């Protein structure tokens, strides 16, 4: 992608996350777990849906049509009819091909973006109590039980509480 997160520094996807597009896996004293993140999953979904509807909306062509097939050779007028229709068809084919390409490149870049944003957000929350391992995982330098992990996932995590423990653990 453009942000190099998905198929980026994030090694691979989790096929076992059936409840969302993005999420957290964690490891702590209690065990390990995997949970989806609704807010970003829905961000991406909403965008892609909006896009989809923009593409399939009111795209139908309605007006009276000339004769597009001919039994007997004629001359000028028919040569012209055919030419008009061929030109039309080529232009529309091109429009379609281009549309699909731009759209798809964008869809990929945008999803990449969402992943990366969720990541930067998490990090900013963790403040100085964690380090960025580089694979999309954070090392948390204090004991963090399940409640605390959830507190990070739901945005209420208060770093000042664990700051001393964490710093102490990082720098010695």
């Amino acid at each position: 992608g453009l942000f190099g997160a998905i198929a980026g520094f994030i090694e691979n996807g989790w096929e076992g996350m059936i409840d969302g597009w993005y999420g957290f896996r964690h490891q702590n004293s209690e065990g390990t777990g995997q949970a989806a993140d609704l807010k970003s999953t829905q961000a991406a979904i909403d965008q892609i849906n909006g896009k989809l509807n923009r593409v399939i909306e009111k795209t139908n062509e309605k007006f009276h049509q000339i004769e597009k097939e001919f039994s007997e050779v004629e001359g000028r007028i028919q040569d012209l009819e055919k030419y008009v229709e061929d030109t039309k068809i080529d232009l529309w084919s091109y429009n379609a091909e281009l549309l699909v390409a731009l759209e798809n490149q964008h869809t990929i870049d945008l999803t990449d973006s969402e992943m990366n944003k969720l990541f930067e957000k998490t990090g900013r929350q963790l403040r100085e109590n964690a380090e960025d391992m580089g694979n999309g995982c954070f090392k948390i330098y204090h004991k963090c039980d399940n409640a605390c992990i959830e507190s990070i996932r739901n945005g209420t995590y208060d770093h000042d509480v664990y700051r001393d423990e964490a710093l102490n653990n990082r720098f010695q």
């Binding site: 096929e15 065990g31 390990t32 995997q34 949970a35 989806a36």
Partner: protein
């Protein structure tokens, strides 16, 4: 189509062992876990345990901690559940259901195997005896049937006129007698008039005992 395919029904005597199999297909097998859950006849669901086909982690309900071990085989994409030192109350249907690859994850048991019935009994195999339930009216609607008694293990098939008779028929769930053998009755409601003309034959098929029997019902005055 994310199918979990479970092994055949088992019949074991107390003290024995059983190992049940689940063959998963339609998804990447090592991306998920598998969780075992049993249900005794006419009872609720009880969670036996969980295992990760991903990291090999294991979580057992305290109850089955001792007697049960869960395994997985990645090359066959297959999960196994082994229970040792069987008692008779272990009789139940055992289900294998797909779960998250890590334990403290956020969804649950999204796909279920068909389940496999494990019966723990000291009773040796036996075919059913079939007796008639004969109609008599005090010109109306009358009832008749078949008593299929003392067989083992379940199941039993029952049909009427080799399938030609359906409407008005009721085959009751088997009941388990003190002896350790099952019994059940099949019953039909038919017009009393057709009693004297048409023939009624009940076809009982007990697969495990290799028994197929046909009986008929007449009043006998």
């Amino acid at each position: 189509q994310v199918q979990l395919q479970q092994s055949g029904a088992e019949v074991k005597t107390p003290g024995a062992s059983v190992k049940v199999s689940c063959k998963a297909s339609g998804y990447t097998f090592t991306s998920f876990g598998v969780s075992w859950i049993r249900q005794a006849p006419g009872q609720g669901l009880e969670w036996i345990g969980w295992i990760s086909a991903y990291n090999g982690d294991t979580y057992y309900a305290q109850k089955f901690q001792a007697r049960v071990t869960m395994t997985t085989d990645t090359s066959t994409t297959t999960a196994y559940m082994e229970m040792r030192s069987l008692r008779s109350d272990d009789t139940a249907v055992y289900y294998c259901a797909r779960e998250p690859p890590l334990f403290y994850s956020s969804w649950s048991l999204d796909n279920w195997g068909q389940g496999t019935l494990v019966t723990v009994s000291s009773a040796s195999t036996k075919g059913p005896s079939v007796f008639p339930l004969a109609p008599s009216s005090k010109g109306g609607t009358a009832a008749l049937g078949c008593l299929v008694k003392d067989y083992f293990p379940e199941p039993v098939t029952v049909s009427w006129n080799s399938g030609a008779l359906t409407s008005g028929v009721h085959t009751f769930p088997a009941v388990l007698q003190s002896s350790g053998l099952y019994s059940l009755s099949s019953v039909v409601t038919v017009p009393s008039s057709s009693l004297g003309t048409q023939t009624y034959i009940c076809n009982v098929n007990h697969k495990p005992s290799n028994t197929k029997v046909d009986k008929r019902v007449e009043p006998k005055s």
